[PDB]
Amino acid sequence: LLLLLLLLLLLLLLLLLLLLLLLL
Amino acid sequence: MSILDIAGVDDTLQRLLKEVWFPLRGGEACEKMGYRYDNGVLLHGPSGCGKTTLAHAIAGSIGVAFIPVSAPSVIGGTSGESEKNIRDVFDEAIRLAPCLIFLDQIDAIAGRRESANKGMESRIVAEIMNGMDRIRQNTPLGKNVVVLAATNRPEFLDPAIRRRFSVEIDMGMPSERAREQILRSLTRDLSLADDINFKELAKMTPGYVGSDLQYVVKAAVSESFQANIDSLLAQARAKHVSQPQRDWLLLEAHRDEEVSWPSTKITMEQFRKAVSLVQPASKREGFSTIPDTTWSHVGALEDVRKKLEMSIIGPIKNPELFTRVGIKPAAGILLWGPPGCGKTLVAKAVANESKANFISIKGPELLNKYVGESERAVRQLFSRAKSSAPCILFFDQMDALVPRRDDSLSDASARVVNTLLTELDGVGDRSGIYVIGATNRPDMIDEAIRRPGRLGTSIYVGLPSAEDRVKILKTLYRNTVTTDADLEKVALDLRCTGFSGADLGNLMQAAAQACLERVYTQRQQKRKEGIEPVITMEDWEKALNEVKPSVKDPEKYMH
Amino acid sequence: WSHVGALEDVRKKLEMSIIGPIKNPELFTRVGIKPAAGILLWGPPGCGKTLVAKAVANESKANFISIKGPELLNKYVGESERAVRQLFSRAKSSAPCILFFDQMDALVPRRDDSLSDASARVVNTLLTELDGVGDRSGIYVIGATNRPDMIDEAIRRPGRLGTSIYVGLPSAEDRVKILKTLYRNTVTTDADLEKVALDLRCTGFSGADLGNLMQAAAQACLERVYTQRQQKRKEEPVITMEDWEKALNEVKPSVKDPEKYM
Ligand SMILES: Nc1ncnc2c1ncn2[C@@H]1O[C@H](COP(=O)(O)OP(=O)(O)OP(=O)(O)O)[C@@H](O)[C@H]1O
Ligand SMILES: Nc1ncnc2c1ncn2[C@@H]1O[C@H](COP(=O)(O)OP(=O)(O)OP(=O)(O)O)[C@@H](O)[C@H]1O
Ligand SMILES: Nc1ncnc2c1ncn2[C@@H]1O[C@H](COP(=O)(O)OP(=O)(O)OP(=O)(O)O)[C@@H](O)[C@H]1O
Ligand SMILES: [Mg+2]
Ligand SMILES: [Mg+2]
Ligand SMILES: [Mg+2]
Secondary structure: OOOEOOOOOOOOOOOEOOOOOOOO | XOHHHOOOOOHHHHHHHHHOHHHHHOHHHHHHOOOOOOOEEEEEOOOOOOHHHHHHHHHHOOOOEEEEEEHHHHOOOEOOHHHHHHHHHHHHHHHOOOEEEEEEOHHHOOEOOOOOOOOHHHHHHHHHHHHHHHHHHHOOOOOOEEEEEEOOOHHHEOHHHHOOOOEEEEOOOOOHHHHHHHHHHHOOOOOEOOOOOHHHHHHOOOOOOHHHHHHHHHHHHHHHOOHHHHHHHHHHHOOOOOHHHHHHHHHHHOOOOOOOOOOOOEOHHHHHHHHHHOOOHHHOOOOOOOOOOOHHHOOOOHHHHHHHHHHHHHHHHOHHHHHHOOOOOOEEEEEEOOOOOOHHHHHHHHHHHOOOEEEEEEOOOOOOOOOOHHHHHHHHHHHHHHHOOOEEEEEEOHHHOOEOOOOOOOHHHHHHHHHHHHHHOOOOOOOOEEEEEEEOOHHHEOOOOOOOOOOOEEEEOOOOOHHHHHHHHHHHHHOOOOOOHHHHHHHHOHHHOOOOHHHHHHHHHHHHHHHHHHHHHHHHHHHHHOOOOOOOHHHHHHHHOOOOOOOOOHHHHHO | OOOOOOOHHHHHHHHHHHHHHHHOHHHHHHHOOOOOEEEEEEOOOOOOHHHHHHHHHHHOOOEEEEEEOOOOOOOEOOHHHHHHHHHHHHHHHOOOEEEEEEOHHHOOEOOOOOOOOOOHHHHHHHHHHHOOOOOOOOEEEEEEEOOHHHEOOOOOOOOOOOEEEEOOOOOHHHHHHHHHHHHHOOOOOOHHHHHHHHOHHHOOOOHHHHHHHHHHHHHHHHHHHHHHHHHHHHOOOOOOHHHHHHHOOOOOOOOOOHHHHO
């Protein structure tokens, strides 16, 4: 049998930083 | 492809004469010293800067074996076929030495292997390193092999592969002198009308690359054959669903009959029209449409108009004159004053009269919720403006983007201020970028922003005087259609005291509504029992008793 | 240094702290000086903090990495601090190297409870890189800011940014040197340039104001040329002394409260 190179997916799921706002 | 097909690059062609031509054609000279002159040249730059054409131009000018390689073509479905294809590329070059390999779009297959989360992809990168090293050792002395690589994303390359290119050539965007040479090489096989001024064509294409200039030639060619299609439509219209649909149907009917197109020359008017039809690749996104406002829409403000012509419109149109006296090609203008007095209006005339590129920012439009994405937008804003100089950046209501830096100021909004400080005046140059700011609160703008080199000059756009209100009212009236003697009386009336430019426009609107009420009542009377809507002097009387000034505290903004 | 006028004392401190040890490492090693410096240039805006940092980066003949404010910040977790760590990795492997942090207060604010974590993790990363367990010798760091008091107090210590140099407003005789420098590099003679710079209407002018004064004088020259050229048509521009007179009337200092930056 021949072994083949296949393209697949990934999960990744990076986490991003955020900026907030405050009251007086 | 041919060496004549590549133009505008002369320093690049000077280097390649000793880094590509000499190793391949001067083989005997290298063998005298017993030196293996196996070279590797990496071409990088903006897309469209003739990297692929340069490689093919110099590949026919040398006459040695040439192996054009495209990166996706060396990928196979079998486990070892992908790496074997790359191995055969360098093996064939050694067998055909002297030879020239062109690895176009090398960043597709030679990306960083720390992020290439596969096994084939990491082994493809390692196979190229081995291939580029076999060339330096397996070739006979005096028969060198040069590897050419072109990529517009050189940062994606693996550092272990990027180091194997001894020479890197940065083919940037063509200059004004370079664009003239490219245009001549694109039109050298065409029939021109002998009045083509390539100096003017190069001057009217500030942010164009070689591919963009090809579209101008392509667009200009279609202009010459435009008149030969109307003569073809005339033969079809007179032979026998809007007009454009008829053309596509008449030409569809005569799909088996063809008429020879007479040969025509491309005039200078067609070329000047072709430039307008072609948008530069750098102008595809991020740039605003030029406002329709001209100086004919702006009444009074002669002092403001003169300052904006000497600071922006002047140096843009004829930078040669302003360079001799020692004026940098960059201006920073801060328009401020009470609302409604013409700050945005006068900044849309400058964007239109200067005939330069225009980017408009609507207050805090660049702010983003993520940590670095709001400062990145500011940095990207000046990258597009620099690449398409001259460009006018207009910040409307700018006090919301550069608030004065205090302890109580938000940390996230203090980074945007400091980002603009470096972009306006820092280490990098912003020559060719003209910045206009409009705000009602100049004191709420950071004091570092309001310094020469960032926003040098502050132009106060205040309430019009009694004489100025006559010029503004006439300007508003004549651009929207009473005569002029009545307009002077209306504008000079004491009821118009404190009126701004927006109040005079509101006064005219209230006069038109009074006209429609008069038309409504009179139309019913003369239709049931028994017209032309025109603003009469009696309608102006109703508006004067209805409209009140909007800037109720002029000194709040005059400070 | 031919583009920099006055600032004789600032030039000496930069030559002794950075330009010196870069060119003669053996001499400074003999007396016991570590081959690394941290300098914070502070003062009112427009007075030449970036200008002298660009002269040091050019006259030292060393490698140069310029950081424009908070351009290292990334939206992903750990990437903002990874860029800072990668920044010093490049500088160390290519020593001697000069790192210029322009508008540094945007990258190292004081660690308060309201500073959030994304920006506080960058301050601490810069603390370890400048002075920590690792070795950063051969890396010379320059910072420029208008707000030195808004920088973390840990950053402003010997070992990270040991020395602070105040680049303030020019004096009466310093404006003469700056105006001559600006005019010489952008071509009135020199006796007239003293009168323009010593004029009381130039009181409080910074280096950017004198450059704006010369541009205002140049613009006044073109207005004079346009009026004369049109008259000759109907009936080589040079900045004359009458152009400086009306340039001195339309230019005001851009630092209204210099004591606020001291
Ligand atoms: N300097 C130049 N002289 C002449 N023609 C040029 C020049 N630069 C570009 N062109 C023309 O514009 C087009 C450029 O396409 P080309 O394949 O050369 O771009 P590239 O630099 O390889 O970029 P990429 O492949 O990344 O898009 C061609 O039609 C070429 O004829
Ligand atoms: N000098 C003027 N000449 C002619 N029309 C004017 C003039 N000033 C104002 N107008 C009219 O009034 C409108 C006022 O809008 P404009 O955007 O100019 O105000 P502004 O000065 O930017 O104030 P704000 O700070 O509120 O935005 C203009 O769009 C135009 O219709
Ligand atoms: N001492 C000086 N000699 C000559 N020119 C000077 C001098 N000081 C300032 N200038 C001129 O004025 C400009 C001021 O900009 P610079 O980048 O030096 O400001 P800065 O001191 O960093 O302040 P900011 O906080 O506004 O950036 C210089 O680029 C130079 O053109
Ligand atoms: Mg290509
Ligand atoms: Mg407005
Ligand atoms: Mg500066």
